[PDB]
Structure 1
């Protein structure tokens, strides 16, 4: 109900999306963000899932891209879904326990700062080290931004972050779908589609297996 960009020009978008949240396009046909508290929680959930999917898509695409060139290292020919049954320096259970404890610590710190902004901006060991007073949930800053990149156009940068996060989330969902249907790595499907795009489509692949 404003002049901000929309996902459907002319459509009557809901009134609870006023543009305050980053990447607001008024897309909510199910009206899941009607409740202000639910929307406040969904914003943080979307941001965390976005950054995690960004790291996931980057960690899926970079090793396969580096394996196809002269660059070599121990785990190169292994697929992203086949990395679990790999011979490491430690069993997966021990690593799972270690990461669960570390993630529990950082996630509890983030949750504490989420229920009360600025309540967790102090380093527990060194009292001198701290985060700036001006902070919002989901945007830590301080040591998390050592180069001061947020000091510039934060709105455009936040829009870039949310858009890249949505794109990465869709890409990861596509990775799962392609792995469950084709049963091959994503870059292989990309090259297969690039060789002949007219006969390498989702409709053709699914019709052949029907």
Structure 2
């Protein structure tokens, strides 16, 4: 029932009606019909943004620090694998940092949830009542102070599509870090260098067959 004008993950394939292009990155991909129920699809829409946005930050935070180290830039945290940052010693114990993390995140996340439950109800500063977000914001897209440079005032639809495409790719990349790190046992950029050294004999088929 989905129209053929919209982009399709599989050209010439029938696609669900409930994926009608409203959401960004709507390519009609749902072989398991997870998002069939509108109430559930409403939740999954926000979950994708949240998992995606954190993934984009996480991937950026796993490649750039390693990229700088190879270039030779020196900082005390240089040369630490992304899966060894936890063991590293900081100014405060890991437990104390974790406790502060949850208290800070509890405020913002509940603030974000309140808007999702009732959009527009969490757009006012509790202390300085003069401050406020624009009233037209939708769940997942606060705007206002969260968009200081006004990029959202342009072609918003294209920007939403660009965000979700980069986000979806970022989420796949992080799963690659876990799979590659757990198998190869080395940092991600090291795996890329090995592949570029000999692309033909360094496939996962070569690597995994050797192990077993």
TM-score normalised according to structure 2 size: 0.98
Structure 1's unaligned 5+ residue stretches are: none
Q: Distance in 1 between matches of 2:72 and 2:86?
A: 25
Deviation at 1:71, TM superposition (A): 0.8
Q: Distance in 2 between matches of 1:76 and 1:195?
A: 24
Note the alpha carbon deviations across 1:71-108, whole angstroms, 9 max, x for none. Answer: 11001111000000111000010110001011110000
Deviation at 1:2, TM superposition (A): 3.5
SS, match of residue 68 in structure 1: helix
Q: Distance in 1 between matches of 2:137 and 2:77?
A: 40
Name the structure 2 match of 1:31: 33
Pairing 1:132-171 to 2, within 5 Å after superposition: 132-171=134-173
Kindly report structure 1 stretches of 4+ aligned residues shifted beyond 2 Å.
Answer: none
Deviation at 1:194, TM superposition (A): 0.5
Deviation at 1:109, TM superposition (A): 0.2
SS, match of residue 112 in structure 1: helix
Structure 2's unaligned 5+ residue stretches are: none
Name the structure 2 match of 1:59: 61
SS, match of residue 58 in structure 2: helix
Q: Aligned pair count?
A: 210
Q: Distance in 2 between matches of 1:78 and 1:21?
A: 39
Q: Distance in 1 between matches of 2:40 and 2:109?
A: 19
Q: Distance in 1 between matches of 2:174 and 2:65?
A: 15
Deviation at 1:129, TM superposition (A): 0.2
CA RMSD, Structure 1 to Structure 2 (Å): 0.5
Note the alpha carbon deviations across 1:132-185, whole angstroms, 9 max, x for none. Answer: 010100000000000000000001110010000000000000000001101100
Q: 1:44 aligns with which of 39, 43, 46?
A: 46
Q: Distance in 1 between matches of 2:15 and 2:26?
A: 11
TM-score normalised according to structure 1 size: 0.99
Deviation at 1:25, TM superposition (A): 0.1
